[PDB]
Design a protein around this nucleic acid. Structure first.
Ligand SMILES: [Cl-]
Ligand SMILES: [Cl-]
Ligand SMILES: [Cl-]
Ligand SMILES: [Cl-]
Ligand SMILES: [Cl-]
Ligand SMILES: [Cl-]
Ligand SMILES: [Cl-]
Ligand SMILES: [K+]
Ligand SMILES: [Mg+2]
Ligand SMILES: [Mg+2]
Ligand SMILES: [Mg+2]
Ligand SMILES: [Mg+2]
Ligand SMILES: [Mg+2]
Ligand SMILES: [Mg+2]
Ligand SMILES: [Mg+2]
Ligand SMILES: [Mg+2]
Ligand SMILES: [Mg+2]
Ligand SMILES: [Mg+2]
Ligand SMILES: [Mg+2]
Ligand SMILES: [Mg+2]
Ligand SMILES: [Mg+2]
Ligand SMILES: [Mg+2]
Ligand SMILES: [Mg+2]
Ligand SMILES: [Mg+2]
Ligand SMILES: [Mg+2]
Ligand SMILES: [Mg+2]
Ligand SMILES: [Mg+2]
Ligand SMILES: [Mg+2]
Ligand SMILES: [Mg+2]
Ligand SMILES: [Mg+2]
Ligand SMILES: [Mg+2]
Ligand code: NA
Ligand code: NA
Ligand code: NA
Ligand code: NA
Ligand code: NA
Ligand code: NA
Ligand code: NA
Ligand code: NA
Ligand code: NA
Ligand code: NA
Ligand code: NA
Ligand code: NA
Ligand code: NA
Ligand code: NA
Ligand code: NA
Ligand code: NA
Ligand code: NA
Ligand SMILES: [Sr+2]
Ligand SMILES: [Sr+2]
Ligand SMILES: [Sr+2]
Ligand SMILES: [Sr+2]
Ligand SMILES: [Sr+2]
Ligand SMILES: [Sr+2]
Ligand SMILES: [Sr+2]
Ligand SMILES: [Sr+2]
Ligand SMILES: [Sr+2]
Ligand SMILES: [Sr+2]
Ligand SMILES: [Sr+2]
Ligand SMILES: [Sr+2]
Ligand SMILES: [Sr+2]
Ligand SMILES: [Sr+2]
Ligand SMILES: [Sr+2]
Ligand SMILES: [Sr+2]
Ligand SMILES: [Sr+2]
Ligand SMILES: [Sr+2]
Ligand SMILES: [Sr+2]
Ligand SMILES: [Sr+2]
Ligand SMILES: [Sr+2]
Ligand SMILES: [Sr+2]
Ligand SMILES: [Sr+2]
Ligand SMILES: [Sr+2]
Ligand SMILES: [Sr+2]
Ligand SMILES: [Sr+2]
Lengths: 172, 142, 132, 337, 160
RNA sequence: AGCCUGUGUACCAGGAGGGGAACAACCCAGAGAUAGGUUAAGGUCCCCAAGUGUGGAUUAAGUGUAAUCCUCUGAAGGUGGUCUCGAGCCCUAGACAGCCGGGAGGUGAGCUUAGAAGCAGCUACCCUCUAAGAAAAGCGUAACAGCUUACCGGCCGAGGUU
RNA sequence: UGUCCCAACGUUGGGCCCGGUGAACUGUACAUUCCAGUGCGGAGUCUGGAGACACCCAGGGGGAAGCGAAGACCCUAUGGA
RNA sequence: CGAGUGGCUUGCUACCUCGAUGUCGGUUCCCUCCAUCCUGCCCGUGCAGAAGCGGGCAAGGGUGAGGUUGUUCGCCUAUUAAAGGAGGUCGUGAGCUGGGUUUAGACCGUCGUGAGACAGGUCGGCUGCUAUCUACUGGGUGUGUAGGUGUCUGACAAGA
RNA sequence: CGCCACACGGGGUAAGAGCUGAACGCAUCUAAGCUCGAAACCCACUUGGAAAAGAGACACCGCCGAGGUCCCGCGUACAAG
């Protein structure tokens, strides 16, 4: 099978070996697309994903390589953004960005601060009870958002009663 | 400390057991062989089950002893020993005229033996001797 | 528990017979167990100054005899070491019956108590005449 | 029901054989942080006494109060960092590359080594710096020796020699730092390395006890009750099951006990001084009198009096440092009595 | 007692009541179920449960499977649903048990079983094209209580 | 049961040599000495004589690389893991899925009930506008509200479904 | 009351080294073994691996289904008392 | 009702051993298994919390002291994070014990005309050996690598 | 029976919580990829270790003499050694 992806005019796609780099006005993203007998290449103004194999496993990855590439196109231009709201009942939760990680304090009244490191060149901006996670690499951005929500996970008590935490509000 | 090898084999991206088999065959024929870039030699399959096997060999033992190597250096050298009658004179002689190295201490480059090559573009389920050694706890001196 | 404030060489074991330093009606106590303790194979469980122990009343009034109660060791013959190095030892081994809250069951303590003990069980202390 | 019970003795300090070097040999060194600096020193054990200190622990209910603390007195006169050895990184680990020696040697270093008469410190240095340029340089260490002569209580004059790593800032800077020490004459002291109140790891060869049985050597029980009168008093039950048909090396047996190297972690240095303040009346038993550079280590130290003990900045301290503890009293009462 | 003890055909046929006494009664309550007054031809669908291996099925197993199957058909079609199912086999083989070592070992009589050759129909149902799936479920529950694997074969039924 | 007890036969016993890791009776084989040659069983990546043989396919589990067997396990049950073959039906008059838009009036059906208005129960389940739109399939409400399904239209474009 | 918790230190005689004296038990052979397997199913000796430079001193006894005694149990004998 | 795994219980068989492989229980000492009792990390709950209950990963460590009884087992007591189970010739008598079982003495009940008998009860009742080989704990002498001193490396190995 | 000392922190995982993500336009923690996550695994720490047969490295001294043995006085050592 063969699939061709016309690259956007705002974007430039370069690739050497199994790595592919995509750049736009919003930044750049490099990925490794490695799978048995699936060739990914930049043919002029289009990216080509092809293979002589056509079994269920090969077709699966081909479809995966595509979305990853289209996602890179999107991220280098429009960019990726996830929205998050910080909710707390009794204890005021302090959420702040420090260095390359967001720190949460007073979660459920805890003395020790909870924290997580931000992935990639991802940017995290907080305004009141709202957080916006954004960047070109959907992987890094997507994980960072998830990590923040996970960072307030509770296993010990009934979640229905204790709901304090930062939740993904808008998914791009 | 200098090893006049008649043959210098490059194990990079080569199937360990297939190279080992030919190096043994040649050592028995009287050739002095030096296997180079051992840390880059390869072994196929699920990294998880491959490692479970080598970890078991590391955990085996008792007073008599079952000293199993952890470095790509010795793993490979042992792989070759299991293909040589190392307890017989001719076998020990062959085994002792074979050596394995991390990286390549020679100026000349080794040759790639036919049939032992692995194409990374066509395979994803394989592991590297170096990766195995690191998992086993070896000191990545290479 | 709260640091005792001294080093103790347990001078008692399960089965040891000791004096009941109070006016509960119990005269002699037998050590059955030591609160929070867990020993090792063949080792007889040991107790010393400051430990809370389960006891059975060996000698005393009919009503008290044979009752299984909690107590606190207040004195022992085997020495203990204080922060300044000095060792301290008493004339006998004694304990005071105490309740679920660690308050002395009796109304008066008999004989001296170790400062270290008094500090750990204040209510027991707030009943002592002498505190050495 | 056959109650459980941990085994007798640790399997981590064997084989329980006689040590090869009476001089202890560290198998680890502190991490590189502060300015370059030698990561160890040495001295000779003298004896013990006690001191009274003002509690330092800011988390202690007794902070600021008198506290009696046992102390082992170690005579720590100046040592000579006589050479600079460089290690290069190779496929088979670290290997000595070369050494930079000096000219001024203590008058009796010739009781142990064949002191250099013809040496070239620059070719060596050159080779070293070239190795650094190439990026094949492994850690840097100093060949060090003690000056037994400065210690009257110790009969020997033959210096004890040990290698001590130099850690610190950047390699270029500590390499320069190393060369400085060496070239001078190598003379350095306990001060230059440790400060009272810091934690050190002490290493030494324990007191020898020759052959001892399982009870003493491994802490196994003696036979009990009636079992102690039949002909067996201090022998273990058995050497193993029917199968495996062999005696495992893990069963407690007789043999050499003592005279083994041991590295005791986190020993607090109570005080580093010089003079005879810690000395004891009548003299330390089987040692002599102290009057010179000394170090007071909190607690016990492996080895008999006179044995060579080695210090190193603790590699795994549990607590933060509380420098220069206040010593209000140092016992000088006779140790006989 | 485990079926492993009697599921194979490793003994002579033992069925002669004239020479065997004390034979326990069968646990099978009914062989013909559903509306047994109506004919089988009066149905558009005919589905049988076929045994894939030759075996012996003790009456306690025939009862459990039949019960656990008709029960479902009753629960899904009612105590009078327009269907009918037949257990076409009867436990003729008498089973023993040697319950003294191997001396005079001939066993005492303990039960009965039906011999079924692979490929045969143990059960057969007749339903309307509507309840065709309710019967397939009844059989699924039936073959779970007998030794061998089974094929749920659909005889008259070209409405798929 | 590597059990007990029959029957027929070949084998061990009393049968070498070759193979089967080893291994009385499993395979080849019945054998004077010595010599050359060709095969048998079984094998041909190395250990160890002979292929890293050819055409093709499947497997990703190190499954497997184990004729027979006390010796080699692997079952009932389950699997949108993957490959191959077949049948029915739908589709460029645009299928399947997704997304967007519409989902409307008589009329909160009648009964029951203080009330029940798709959605407690009982019964009925009809017709207008129209490209569609139930006397309502699933939540939801104290009952409404509200959220969706059916149903129609659009965007999209090639197989889809059983 | 050291039977025990829980062991310690000490005493005398041995043990250890030296001079002299100087046996016995036991010995199919070979024998540096270990892990698995196999085998008359409980192998230092067979198979596959692993380990293994030779010799000597002291030791406590895991194994040699250790040595000692043609099993006192059980059965058998057209045995004995 | 159906399908299995183990080889901890019991039974079956009579393949090994009668020119002997010393019983049970305990003790001492060592290694192991996981079908996990505690401890670590998880999932569900008829999960508010606290705590229960059920389930998953996981064998690093721990799992103790006592009363009857020879007991194994089990019952009981106070402690405990918990006081799990099992294999190693039902590990362990050329290690210990000798309470039970199982010689010769004796009594009771029952059986027998009797001698005598009875997984019925009861009191008493013997435990040999100087280690040849192997195994291991420690200690030496030589040879090999191939003039001496001093300092190291670190393949491997042990640990809870 | 007394006294002293005996980690924190990394790395990779299990169960599990998730991210991106297709086969199957959607969905999906999984098929490729990734973020986390156990007293458990590896490292950290301690102890042994040139007989590691690839039998090792460095510095200096020496080959008419460096070093060593016997001898003598002794123990921080020790059953002989
Ligand atoms: Cl080993
Ligand atoms: Cl060989
Ligand atoms: Cl692959
Ligand atoms: Cl207790
Ligand atoms: Cl004992
Ligand atoms: Cl013939
Ligand atoms: Cl494999
Ligand atoms: K016998
Ligand atoms: Mg006990
Ligand atoms: Mg004194
Ligand atoms: Mg005094
Ligand atoms: Mg015969
Ligand atoms: Mg031929
Ligand atoms: Mg060949
Ligand atoms: Mg397998
Ligand atoms: Mg006989
Ligand atoms: Mg008899
Ligand atoms: Mg007669
Ligand atoms: Mg027989
Ligand atoms: Mg014997
Ligand atoms: Mg499990
Ligand atoms: Mg709870
Ligand atoms: Mg364990
Ligand atoms: Mg036994
Ligand atoms: Mg024995
Ligand atoms: Mg005996
Ligand atoms: Mg004996
Ligand atoms: Mg008795
Ligand atoms: Mg008589
Ligand atoms: Mg009898
Ligand atoms: Mg008796
Ligand atoms: Na492979
Ligand atoms: Na090993
Ligand atoms: Na004796
Ligand atoms: Na035995
Ligand atoms: Na024949
Ligand atoms: Na053969
Ligand atoms: Na396999
Ligand atoms: Na005594
Ligand atoms: Na022995
Ligand atoms: Na089974
Ligand atoms: Na565990
Ligand atoms: Na008991
Ligand atoms: Na036995
Ligand atoms: Na025993
Ligand atoms: Na005995
Ligand atoms: Na015994
Ligand atoms: Na981790
Ligand atoms: Sr070949
Ligand atoms: Sr046992
Ligand atoms: Sr040293
Ligand atoms: Sr080391
Ligand atoms: Sr005795
Ligand atoms: Sr054995
Ligand atoms: Sr039969
Ligand atoms: Sr079935
Ligand atoms: Sr081939
Ligand atoms: Sr092919
Ligand atoms: Sr067998
Ligand atoms: Sr089979
Ligand atoms: Sr199956
Ligand atoms: Sr062999
Ligand atoms: Sr002996
Ligand atoms: Sr015999
Ligand atoms: Sr498991
Ligand atoms: Sr738990
Ligand atoms: Sr038993
Ligand atoms: Sr019982
Ligand atoms: Sr009895
Ligand atoms: Sr009797
Ligand atoms: Sr007796
Ligand atoms: Sr030689
Ligand atoms: Sr996962
Ligand atoms: Sr050497």
């Amino acid at each position: 099978p063969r699939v061709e992806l016309e690259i956007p005019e705002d974007v430039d796609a370069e690739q050497d070996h199994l790595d592919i780099t995509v750049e736009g006005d919003n930044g750049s993203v490099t990925r490794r697309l490695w799978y048995p007998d699936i060739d990914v290449s930049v043919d002029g103004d289009t990216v080509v994903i092809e293979s002589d194999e056509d079994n269920a496993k090969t077709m699966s990855t081909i479809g995966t390589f595509q979305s990853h590439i289209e996602n890179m196109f999107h991220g280098v231009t429009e960019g990726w953004e996830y929205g998050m709201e910080v909710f707390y009942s009794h204890f005021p939760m302090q959420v702040n960005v420090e260095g390359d990680e967001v720190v949460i304090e007073n979660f459920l009244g805890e003395k020790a601060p909870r924290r997580t490191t931000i992935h990639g060149d991802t940017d995290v901006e907080i305004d009141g009870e709202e957080l916006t996670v954004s960047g070109p690499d959907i992987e890094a951005v997507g994980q960072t958002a998830a990590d923040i929500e996970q960072l307030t996970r509770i296993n010990d008590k009934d979640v229905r009663v204790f709901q304090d935490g930062v939740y993904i509000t808008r998914k791009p | 400390a200098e090893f006049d090898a008649d043959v210098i084999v490059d194990a990079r991206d080569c199937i360990m057991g297939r190279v080992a088999s030919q190096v043994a065959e040649q050592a028995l024929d009287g050739e002095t062989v030096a296997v180079v870039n051992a840390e880059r030699a390869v072994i196929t399959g699920r990294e998880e089950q491959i490692v479970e096997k080598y970890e078991k060999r590391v955990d085996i033992g008792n007073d008599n002893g079952y000293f199993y190597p952890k470095r790509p250096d010795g793993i490979f050298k042992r792989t070759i020993r299991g293909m040589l009658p190392h307890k017989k004179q001719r076998g020990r002689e062959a085994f002792e005229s074979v050596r394995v190295y991390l990286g390549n201490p020679y100026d000349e480059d080794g040759e790639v033996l036919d049939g032992t090559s692995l194409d990374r573009l066509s395979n994803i389920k394989f592991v590297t001797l170096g990766e195995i050694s690191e998992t086993l706890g070896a000191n990545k001196t290479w | 528990m709260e640091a005792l404030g001294a080093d103790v060489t347990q001078g008692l074991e399960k089965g040891s017979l000791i004096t009941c330093a109070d006016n509960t009606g119990a005269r002699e106590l037998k050590v059955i167990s030591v609160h929070g303790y867990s020993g090792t194979k063949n080792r007889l469980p040991k107790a010393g100054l400051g430990d809370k122990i389960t006891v059975s009343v060996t000698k005393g009034t009919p009503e008290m005899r044979r009752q299984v109660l909690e107590a606190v060791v207040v004195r022992q013959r085997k020495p203990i070491r204080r922060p300044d190095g000095t060792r301290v030892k008493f004339e006998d081994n004694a304990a005071v019956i105490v309740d679920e809250n660690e308050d002395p069951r009796g109304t008066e303590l008999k004989g001296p108590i170790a400062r270290e003990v008094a500090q750990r069980f204040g209510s027991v202390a707030s009943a002592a005449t002498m505190i050495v | 029901p056959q109650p459980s019970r941990p085994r007798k003795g640790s399997l981590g300090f064997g084989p329980r054989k006689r040590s090869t070097s009476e001089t202890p040999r560290f198998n680890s060194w502190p991490s590189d942080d502060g300015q370059p600096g030698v990561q160890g020193f040495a001295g000779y054990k003298a004896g013990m006494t006690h001191v009274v200190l003002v509690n330092d622990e800011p988390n202690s209910p007794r902070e600021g109060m008198e506290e009696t603390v046992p102390v082992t007195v170690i005579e720590t006169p100046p040592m000579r960092a006589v050479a600079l050895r460089a290690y290069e990184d190779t496929p088979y680990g670290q290997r000595p590359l070369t050494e930079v020696w000096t000219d001024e040697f203590h008058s009796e270093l010739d009781r142990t080594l064949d002191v250099p008469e013809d040496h070239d410190p620059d070719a060596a240095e050159e080779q070293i710096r070239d190795a650094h340029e190439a990026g094949d340089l492994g850690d840097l260490r100093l060949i060090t020796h003690t000056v037994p002569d400065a210690v009257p209580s110790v009969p020997k004059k033959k210096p004890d020699v040990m290698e001590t790593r130099v850690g610190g800032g950047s390699v270029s800077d500590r390499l320069d730092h190393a060369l400085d020490i060496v070239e001078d004459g190598g003379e350095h002291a306990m001060n230059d390395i440790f400060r009272a109140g810091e934690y050190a790891d002490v290493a030494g060869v324990t007191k020898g006890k020759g052959t001892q049985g399982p009870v003493k050597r491994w802490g196994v029980q003696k036979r009990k009750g009636k079992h102690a009168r039949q002909g067996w008093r201090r022998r273990i039950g058995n050497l193993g099951p029917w199968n495996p048909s062999r005696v495992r090396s893990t069963v407690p047996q007789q043999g050499q006990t003592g005279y083994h190297q041991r590295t005791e972690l986190n020993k607090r240095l109570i005080d580093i001084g010089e003079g005879d303040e810690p000395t004891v009346d009548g003299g330390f038993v089987n040692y002599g009198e102290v009057d010179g550079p000394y170090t007071l280590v909190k607690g016990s130290v492996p080895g008999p009096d006179k044995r060579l003990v080695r210090f190193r900045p603790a590699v795994r301290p549990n607590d933060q440092p509380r420098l220069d503890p206040e010593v209000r009293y140092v016992s000088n009462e006779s140790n006989q009595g | 007692k485990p079926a492993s003890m009697y599921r194979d055909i490793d003994k002579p046929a033992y069925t002669r009541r004239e020479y065997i006494t004390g034979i326990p009664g069968s646990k099978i309550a009914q062989h013909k179920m559903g509306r047994k007054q109506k004919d089988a031809d009066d149905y558009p669908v005919q589905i049988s449960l076929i045994v894939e291996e030759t075996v012996q099925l003790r009456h306690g197993s025939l009862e459990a499977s039949r019960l656990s199957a008709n029960r479902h058909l009753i629960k899904e079609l009612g105590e009078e649903g327009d269907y009918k199912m037949t257990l076409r086999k009867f436990p003729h083989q008498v089973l023993r048990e040697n319950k003294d070592g191997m001396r005079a070992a001939f066993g005492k009589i303990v039960g009965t079983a039906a011999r079924v050759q692979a490929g045969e129909q143990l059960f057969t149902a007749y339903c309307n094209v509507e309840d065709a799936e309710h019967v397939k479920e009844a059989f699924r529950r039936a073959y779970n209580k007998i030794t061998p694997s089974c094929r749920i074969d659909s005889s008259p039924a070209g409405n798929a």
